[PDB]
Subunit: 292 residues, 4 copies
């Protein structure tokens, strides 16, 4: 009878969905937090059965989406939403979509929960290389993908039982440089990986709650493609060609690792970057003239 809130699904091709899927296997109940620029479209599609293929696990196995909620990790409380957004065509009529508000909403409909998933990032100047990134873009990049965590945490902590567990998805570009992962994104993942440690410290001592981050390998998500055959087709090709594990990398591969961190089985792991990436990170050089 565990409940998990997933911040950041827009379709079935992301890591969000992968996570959601494997969490169903373990019979855990799933709440989607959905960015308002996509909420209505995700909703409609779902009613249309556009996802019925993708909700299939195996033997009789569907999914169990408890609830689907509008949610914007930019806004901490309702006093944050600026007037222009408060009025936006997309945001206009949706309510309780800040971080503080969803916590309450969830706690009202379902009480305390014990699993929190951060699978989101956003950065305006991503296509600009770091050196040519504006201040206003960089701080945006960090607001939307680093802080959204810290803040998710402050607020969700009170609707969580002790022994609850939290995860987030990071990228190796934080540790080693991969060019064209810019406009703040590499800084943001770097900070997110440090905050994972510090938060683990406070949440551990104070609430008996754990937090970790998964350094994911390359997956063909909506957002991955949005990064301008692109950077992510190369990323995949390279990985499928050079990683120690040569199999294709599925979102469920991260999904099953996520479920594990989230469950009691990993109670002795906290503050860690766990790479789930067919082991690419362990490589230094292409092994070209070594494969002869």
């Amino acid at each position: 009878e565990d409940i998990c809130f997933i911040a950041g699904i827009g379709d079935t091709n992301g890591y969000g969905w992968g996570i959601a899927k494997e969490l169903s296997k373990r019979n855990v109940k799933i709440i989607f937090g959905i960015w308002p620029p996509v909420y209505n479209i995700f909703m409609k599609n779902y009613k249309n059965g556009k996802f019925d293929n993708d909700m299939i696990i195996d033997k009789d196995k569907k999914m169990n989406i408890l609830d689907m909620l509008p949610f914007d990790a930019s806004f901490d409380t309702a006093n944050d939403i600026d007037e222009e957004t408060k009025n936006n065509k997309r945001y206009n009529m949706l309510q309780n979509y800040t971080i503080e508000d969803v916590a309450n909403l969830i706690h009202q409909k379902y009480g305390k929960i014990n699993m929190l998933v951060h699978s989101l990032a956003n950065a305006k100047e991503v296509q600009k290389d770091l050196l040519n990134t504006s201040r206003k873009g960089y701080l945006d990049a960090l607001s939307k993908s680093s802080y959204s965590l810290i803040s998710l945490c402050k607020y969700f902590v009170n609707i969580m039982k002790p022994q609850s567990s939290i995860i987030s998805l990071t990228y190796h570009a934080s540790q080693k440089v991969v060019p064209g992962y810019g406009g703040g994104m590499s800084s943001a993942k770097a900070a997110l990986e440090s905050d994972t440690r510090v938060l683990a410290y406070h949440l551990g001592r104070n609430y008996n709650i754990r937090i970790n981050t998964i350094s994911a390998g390359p997956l063909k998500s909506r957002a991955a493609t949005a990064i301008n055959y692109t950077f992510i087709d190369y990323a995949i090709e390279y990985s499928e060609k050079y990683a120690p594990l040569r199999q294709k990398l599925l979102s469920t591969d991260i999904g099953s690792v996520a479920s594990f961190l989230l469950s009691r089985e990993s109670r002795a792991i906290t503050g860690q970057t766990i790479y789930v990436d067919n082991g690419l990170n362990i490589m230094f050089l292409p092994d070209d003239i070594y494969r002869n």
Copy 2:
């Protein structure tokens, strides 16, 4: 029908036993590899009912020990056994206890296995500190504690299914210095951790097998008490006071992590050091100032 071989275990108060309990939850067959010198005394205790309590997994299921074999990580093959130990009282009443010998044995009787555990260390001069450690002592430590993993992998690979998984147990003394943990042990784990990556690539690319290592926090095992109010009673004292996670670290804590890494659920993780240490590894200074 999964079989796991565990190399290194002389009692129930160690990590290997933590690992075996937790795998038995997943109905995994366990073969034990026991250091010849304690092999007979372990057999006797087993036979005398000393482990029946420790063998209970829960309400009407116990531990499924498929077999228990003498195994010595010092000797790769038959040729490697030296006169003094052919002589040696504890060794003479036993046979086929070299790495290549237990590999053929297991395989002769039960076929291919698919989970392998290296949970052993020896450092004749642990008592001394690195600077006062001798060449003979140091290398004995590297031989038994680091190379034994490579030799295990080489001889056991043939008898394992593709998509199999191997683990080792390491310690933070390799990354950050821990005074008292001497005689080569740090160097040994330092090498175990890197070999984990290198092997992760060879196994990864050639046999589609995965290999990871578990950085465990402190446990009051017999090996740990033999370092010596013992450089383990401090370790435990400090950890329970300072680690993000106030809980007391149990062997099964590592076992559950082992079980997972050894399963299909983690098919995309290879070559990693996975810290299962209540998060102690993330801390810099004691937090005495902060706690006020």
Copy 3:
């Protein structure tokens, strides 16, 4: 005949000054970038000879401060300065103090330069632990101490010869948690250490310019004290008691390491975190019951 611009001196008790000092030894000419809330006071004191003690190197050795400039790393170009600051009592009448403007000023008075020093940080909610840090505070923390680098870089790159070198000062709290280094500061140093890599990449390939960061140990600076005998007296005590090198840690110790990175001698080092900290970072545990 090398010139260096030091962003971030307010007195003689910081790392800025340490760096400035050792750079004089190697006869390099020094330009101070000084935060306007302190500019006038630093100026007056200097004219008064309040620093004449502290400008002494050794035999006949004074310093050679080329020029002392107002400078605020918050503002990239003059179009950034908001009206309230444009009007502030402290900022009112000072000109050309944004990042873009000082670059020009310097290039006009002295042409191209070849050494850039980032020794600054600022964070509003430093006294708040991370979990209880506002978004607006965090993004501030990162703006002032992470981005100020990236932006210093964009702009200063064009007033720099190829083979010029750049450094910044970081703290170990980015890698391992030290509580009460909050309100964004640990995230900010974490990002700064990642940006050091990425910038090294671009500046290396494009301009033949190097960038590194120095993970400094604890020094009793103005700002260190401002962090609420405080956290930094403990930090020092602990370090002087537990670091492998038991000597007291001087700003000139970082200063001499800085000068080296900045000089040609280190032409093969870039993108690195170099710890200058009497080796504290290498420790895992206090060695209390080991010193018996």
Copy 4:
């Protein structure tokens, strides 16, 4: 009046020679430690004028070689020398070439020294890959390439002044996997790097001596060509194409870094791996996509 002993050098095309040139710039006396087997052929070349060109530091100063001694990193003391090598043609015409023997020698003739360099490696089975590497081979690699540093430190510490400095040369194959670099070499450097920390603490606390290691990028030395268009011609090719720093890495590049770490100028750096590799270590994937 500073004396530096360099352990491991058979010609001018290596790193040790890079180190000696650059220290001679600082008027540091150089004692060479040469592997007995090449000691005589090196002596002859020296005598025959083959190094006169390489010995020029600049306009009217050459290299000050105080002495040149046979030195074998395999043997700590007299007792350690085995019959076959007492016999051995190359070895028999020589004496006092064990670690403890060259320590007493140097000290007998010239007193206390204050800079020590370990610039040597051997891996009998480098050609094989870790999985196919034998126990005898692996340990020989750890013995000659890793433990020889500890033994050097122990026997040389007495004959060194407080505030002295020791360096070792390492390689990234220990952190991230490099296929081809086999037979134990990775494990060896993996251990050299951790020992550097542990020794950094013992030396640090007890004798006020410092110890660091230099992670060098590739150089076409005789040792490197003997790995084998050679797993060094790739290394160099790749590095000059991909490393942030387009320059061609010279031995003196490392030498200047060595000189510095070995000086007082770095009194606050101990226990560190310092990458002197044109920054190649910071990169993740080749940047082919980006460069377009």
